[PDB]
Amino acid sequence: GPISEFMSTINVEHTYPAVSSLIADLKSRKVQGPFAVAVETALVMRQVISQTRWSTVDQLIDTVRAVGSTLVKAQPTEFSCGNIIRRILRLIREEYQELLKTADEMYSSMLNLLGRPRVTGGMDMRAVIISGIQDVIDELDKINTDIEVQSMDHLHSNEIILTQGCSKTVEAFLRFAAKKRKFSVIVAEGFPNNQKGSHAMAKRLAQAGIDTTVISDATIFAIMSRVNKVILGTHAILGNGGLVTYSGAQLVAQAARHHATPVVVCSGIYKLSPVYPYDLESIIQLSSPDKIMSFNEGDLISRAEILNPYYDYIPPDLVDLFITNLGGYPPSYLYRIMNDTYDASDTIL
Amino acid sequence: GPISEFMSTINVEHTYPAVSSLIADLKSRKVQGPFAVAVETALVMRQVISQTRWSTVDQLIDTVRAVGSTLVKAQPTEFSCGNIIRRILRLIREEYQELLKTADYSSMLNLLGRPTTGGMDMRAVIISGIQDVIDELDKINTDIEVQSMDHLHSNEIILTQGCSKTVEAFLRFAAKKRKFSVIVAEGFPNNQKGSHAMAKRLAQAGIDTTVISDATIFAIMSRVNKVILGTHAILGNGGLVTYSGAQLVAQAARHHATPVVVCSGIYKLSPVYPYDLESIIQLSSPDKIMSFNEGDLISRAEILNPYYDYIPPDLVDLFITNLGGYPPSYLYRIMNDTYDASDTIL
Amino acid sequence: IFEEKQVSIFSHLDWRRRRTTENIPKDIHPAVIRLGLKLANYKIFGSNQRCIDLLKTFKIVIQDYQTPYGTTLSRHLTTHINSQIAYLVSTRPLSISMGNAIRFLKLEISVLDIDLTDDEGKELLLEKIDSYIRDRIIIAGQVIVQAATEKIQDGDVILTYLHSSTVNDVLIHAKNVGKKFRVVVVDSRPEFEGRVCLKLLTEHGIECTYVMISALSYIMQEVTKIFLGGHAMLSNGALYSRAGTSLISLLGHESNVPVIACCESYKFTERIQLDSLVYNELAPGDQLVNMGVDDFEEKPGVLANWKSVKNLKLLSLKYDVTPPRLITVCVCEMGLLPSTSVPAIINEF
Amino acid sequence: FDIVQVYKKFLQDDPEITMPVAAIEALVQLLSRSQAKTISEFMDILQNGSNTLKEGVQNNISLSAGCDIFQRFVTRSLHDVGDFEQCKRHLVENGKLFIQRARACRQRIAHLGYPLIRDGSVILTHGFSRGVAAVLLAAAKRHVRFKVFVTESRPSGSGCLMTRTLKNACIPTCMVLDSAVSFTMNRVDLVLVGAEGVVENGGLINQIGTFQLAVFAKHAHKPFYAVAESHKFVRMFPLSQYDIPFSRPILEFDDPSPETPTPSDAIHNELIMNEEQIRNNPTLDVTPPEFVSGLITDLGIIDSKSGVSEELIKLYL
C-alpha cells in the first residue's frame, strides 16, 4: 500500500515536497550510501510529520507507513531508509501506547496460542514525535564516536589487520587505537568501485602512524597467513545476519575462514534491516561496465558480457564479531536486537 | 619365526654375544630411543653377518629374519631396530641379484604372465653396506639442519614440544644467522627434564625461547607461525608414534590453521601398519604423574602414564628428512625404495 | 651483509632489478641482452614462452661461442653460460621452468665425456635443446590440451583467470572440435592480462564473459568448470601460479566447481613452500598507483608519492600458492593425476 | 562370437570372479578362437572386441579395468621384438591360471584386512561385497569377538545376502535402513566397504549408498576402509562424485499439466518405489579419496592414494 493510492502524486507533492524530491534523488542515486540515505530520510519524515495532520493515531501510522513505502521502493537496496521508517513507526506506537497508560481512573509468542481475543485517540503528538526523530538524527551523528572507543579491546600493538575498501567507521576504529598503539593495517583496494576511497583512506591511516600496506584484491589470500584479524565495514546487515557489503569482501571472508582468521564487522545498528535475503539476485546491484572495461574497446565490449557488481554478500556464519554503537555482539544476538528496535509488523513496508 | 628355534640359548650366547646383550638391554630399556637402538642393532648385525656361516642366500636371509624377529619381540615399540634389520635384509637381497647376473614395472601386470656360491663371502660386501648405514645414521642431523633456511625465517614464532636433537639442530642452525622465536611446550611428565635443557640451549644460541605448560599450547597457538615436531617413529600408514602430549600440539594446530612440520631421519620410518594404537602406546610408571607417598590416592584411583602419543597421518603437512622435504603422500614411495615389503613382518 | 630481514613480512623478497643496460658487463651476448630487456619489460609472456626463448637464445650463445685453447669445451662453456644467467636473473628472477631447463642444459654440458670436435659438440647440444623444447614443452602441451579438452562437455561454463597459454590453447582447440561452451574470464589489477585473453578468445569466436576478481563470488554461480595454467607445481601437490589463483580455487571449491590444473611436467619442482610469502616475486609498487580502468594511461593517483610517505607502502605479489586440497585434478602429459602425485613423476623423469 | 554372452557367462559360472577378470577371460577365449595372424589383423581384434564388450554391457567400468590391464600386457610384450603367437597360447594356456591369483588376491586381502577388526568392535558395511565378507570371515575363524551392522542396500537388496552370509559364520548381525545409517555411526567402530572399481585418484566406484556411509564416517570420526583387488584400478578421472558414464537416462522429471496422513512409527513396506522409478535412480556413486582411510588391496594397504595413481602410472609405460 504505497502513497499513490492514498492520494494523487500531484499532491504528495504540494503536501509532501520533501518526499517526491527524495524519491527522485534516491532513484537517480544522488543521495546514496547508508548514512546519507538515513539522515535525509529522517529529515524528510520530520517535515512530513510537521505538515501532515492525522487526528486519530491510525491516520499518522497509515500515512508514515505509506509514505515510507514509496521511499523504500525508490531505491530498495538502501535499507537504511526503511530502517529509519520502522524506527519512527515504533516511536509513534510506543509513545502513544505510553500515552494510553497515561490516562488513569504478549511477553511470549509461544504462550499466546492459548491467549484470548481508542479512548481519546489523539493528534498533536507532533512535539514528541519530532523530538524522537531529531533524537534519531543525533544518534546517527554519534555512531563513530562510541564505536571507535571499543578498538582498545581488539586492536593491540604489532598486530596485523586486514581491511578492504573504504569505511569511515572502520577508519575511525583504527585511528582511535592508533593514537596510543602502533600496529599494521593491510588495505585491500575495493577495485573497481571502492578504489579511490580506499587509496585515500590508506594515506590517512599512514598519516595516523599506522604501518599501512596497499594491496590488489588478488593478493588477499597470499598475505592472509600473517594476518591476525579481519575488520570490515558493511553497507547493510539483513534479517538472517547476512552482510550486504561492497564487492570483493567475499574474497576476504573466504580467505579468512580458510586461514582460521577472525572476521570482525564495524557497523552502526541503523544498517540492521529485518528483510530476509530470499533471492540474492535482487540484492546485488550492478553498476556500469565502464568501471571494469573501457568504452573505447569497441570490439571487446561488442563481443563480450561485462559485469560490474558493486555489492557482495557474506553469509552470517563468516562473521565472528559485530562491533556496533550498542557494543560488541555475536551474529546470533542480532535476532533480539531487531526485536528491540523494530515492531514486527513493519518488516514488509 | 624367531631365533629361540633354529638355535639354543647357549648357542646364541656363544655365537652371537651381541644379540644376547642387545636382547637383554632392549628388555631392560638400557638401550633406548630411536637413535641408540638403530646404531646398536646395526652393530649387532655386523657381528651376525661376520659370525654366521651359510652356503645359500636363503639361509642368510632367514637367519637374519630370525635374529630380527627375536630382537623385535624384545622391545617391539622401538621400531628403529626392525627397520635397520629390514634395511640390511634388502641390502643382502639385491647385492645377491646383481651378483646373480654378473654371472650372465607394475605389480598390476603380474596377474597376467609367466609363472616361475650365491650366499657366501658376499659377507665382505654385506659388512660394508652395514657400515654405510652407520655413516648415514651420523649424517642425519647434518642433512636435516641445513634445510632450516627454507622454512625458518626471522620474526617467525615456532612451537615445539618435548626434546628432539633433530629439531634442536634444525632450529639452532637457522638461528646462527636469522633471529626468530621458539615456544617450547615441555613434555610433562616424560620429556620434561629434557625439554627444559633444550630450551636453555636454544636461548643460549639467542632464539628468544619461551617455556610453557602443556595446557598453554592452545592459548598461544593463535600467534604461532609454524609447528616443528620430532617423532619416535613413522608408521606404515604415514602415522606418527611420538612422545606424550604431541597430539595436543597437532589438534590445536589444525584448529588454528597452523602448518605441522616433522623433522625425522628416514630410519624412523617403519612399514608396521598400525592395526592398533593400544599395542603401540606404551605406558610408563604412574610415579611420573603421581607420587607413591600419596597412599590414599594411589589405592583408590587408576593412575595412567602413557609414554607415547599417536598422530594420524593427515595432521602432518611436511616431513623434513635427511633425503629432503616430502609430503605425507610420498612416504609410500620412500618405503618401496627402502624396504622389500616382505620383511614388513619380521 | 647483503641481507635485510626485519619486521616487514616482505623485507626478504628480492626487490633489486636492472631496467637498463648501463654498465652492463662486457661478456654478455647480444641475444642475452635483448632477452634481459624483454624479460624486465614485457607484460605479455610467462613461464612457458620464457623457457622457450631462454633455450633458443642459449643455442645462439653456444653457437657463437668460441673455444679458447688454453682449455676446451666442457670445463669453460658452463662458465660462460653462468655469466649470461647471472645477468638475466638480475633483470628478472628466474622462473621455475627456466631454472629447470638450466639444470638440464648444465647437466648435459658436463656429461659429454671429453669426446668430439667442438662443432659436433655444439651440434648435439642444440639437438636436446631442440628436443627439450620439442618433447617437454610443445609436444607435452599438445597432449595436455587434448587431455583437458575431452573433459569439456556441451553446455560448460568455463572459468579462466588471466592470460594463460595452455588454458587458452585448450579453449580454442575445444571450439575448433565443435564443443558448445562459453568462457568466463577473470581479470585483476595492476595490469590486466585478462583483456589480452578476452581479446584472443573473442577473435576465435568464443562466447565470453568478463569480470574482475572482486566479482568472483557473483560470477562463480554460473561457472561449471575452472581451468588453470601453472607457473609451477609444488612437490606437496600445491599449485604455484599467478597472485589471485588461490582465490579462484577457493571460491570454486565453495561452489562445488572442479579445479583443473594444467601444467607441463618440466615445470614440476622439488620445492615445497607452506605459504605464498616465502617464495614469490615482487612487482613494482608504482603499478598500483594507476587509477583503475586502464594502465599506463598516465592518471596520477593519491598514492603517487607513496615512496616519500612514511608508514605508506604499496605492494603487489606476482604469485600464489594454492593448497593441494583445492586442486581437483592435475593435467600434464602423463595424463590426469592427483596433484599429490607430483614428486612421483619427478622420479620417472 | 558374442563376447558379451561369454562375459556374462563366467559371471554366472563362478560367484567369486571379478568383473575385470571376467573381461580378461573373455578376451582370452576370443584370443583362442581368433584366427588373426596380422598385427594389423592381430591387433584389430579385441579392440573391437573390448569395444564391443564395453558397448555390450551397460555399466562397463569394472570390465573396462580388466580390459585396460589386458591390452597393456599385450602391447608391452608385443613391443619387445614381440611375436604374436607365443602370447596367444600363453594367455589361452594360463587362463585357468589367471583366475588363480584373482582368487589369491582376495585371500591376500582378507589376510591383510582382518586385523583391522579387533576384539569387541562393531563393524558397518553397505550391501554385499566378496572382499568385505572375506575379511570379516577370516577374522571370525580366529575367534575374534565382533558384530556387524549391514545396510539394507536398495535397490540391489544386497543387505539380506550379506546378513545371511555373516550369520552362517556365527557373526552377530543387525540390519539398518539406508536412512538410519547416520543414527548408527556412534555405535560403529569401523566402516568396511568393497568397490567395483578404483579410479585414478584413488576414489571408489561402488553401490549407490557407499558415499553416504563414507560421509557419515567422516562426520562421526570413524575409520572408513575400502576393499578391492588390484585389477579394479582403472584409469579414469571423475571430476566430481557425479561424473560417470550413465547406462540409462537418470533422475529426470515428470511433466504434469492439469492432467486429471502418515505417522513416523508406521511401517509401510508396500509404500516403496516401483522399478520404473528405480531405473531413474543411479546404480552407483563415487567416493572421493579424502573419505577413504585406507585402501586394502593385494598390494597391501594403500593409504597414500596418490599410490593408486602410482600403480596406474607404472601400468602405462
CSV table of C-alpha atoms in Angstrom, one decimal, chain B residues 150-151 153-155 177-178 226 259 261 317-318 325-327 329-330 333 337, chain C residues 3 5-7 12 235-236 270 272-274 278-279 340-341 343-344 347-348:
chain,number,residue,atom,x,y,z
B,150,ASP,CA,63.9,-22.7,3.6
B,151,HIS,CA,61.3,-22.7,6.4
B,153,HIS,CA,62.6,-17.1,8.9
B,154,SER,CA,63.2,-14.0,11.0
B,155,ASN,CA,60.5,-12.8,13.4
B,177,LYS,CA,72.1,-16.2,11.1
B,178,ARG,CA,68.3,-15.4,11.4
B,226,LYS,CA,54.7,-22.9,12.4
B,259,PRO,CA,51.2,-25.9,9.4
B,261,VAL,CA,56.3,-29.8,10.1
B,317,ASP,CA,51.9,-31.1,6.4
B,318,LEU,CA,55.6,-31.6,5.7
B,325,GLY,CA,61.3,-32.3,2.2
B,326,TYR,CA,58.4,-34.5,1.2
B,327,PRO,CA,54.6,-34.6,1.6
B,329,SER,CA,51.6,-38.9,0.4
B,330,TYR,CA,55.1,-39.6,-0.8
B,333,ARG,CA,57.3,-44.4,-2.4
B,337,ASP,CA,62.6,-48.0,-2.3
C,3,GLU,CA,70.7,-9.1,3.8
C,5,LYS,CA,65.2,-9.5,7.4
C,6,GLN,CA,63.1,-7.1,9.5
C,7,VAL,CA,59.6,-6.7,10.9
C,12,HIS,CA,63.2,-10.6,2.4
C,235,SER,CA,56.0,-31.3,-4.6
C,236,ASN,CA,53.4,-31.3,-1.9
C,270,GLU,CA,61.2,-30.4,-5.7
C,272,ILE,CA,57.8,-27.2,-1.1
C,273,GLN,CA,56.5,-23.9,0.5
C,274,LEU,CA,53.8,-23.7,3.2
C,278,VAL,CA,58.5,-17.2,1.5
C,279,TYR,CA,58.9,-17.7,-2.3
C,340,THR,CA,49.8,-35.0,-4.9
C,341,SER,CA,51.5,-37.5,-7.2
C,343,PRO,CA,57.0,-36.0,-6.7
C,344,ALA,CA,56.4,-39.4,-8.1
C,347,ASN,CA,61.4,-39.9,-10.3
C,348,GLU,CA,60.2,-41.1,-13.7
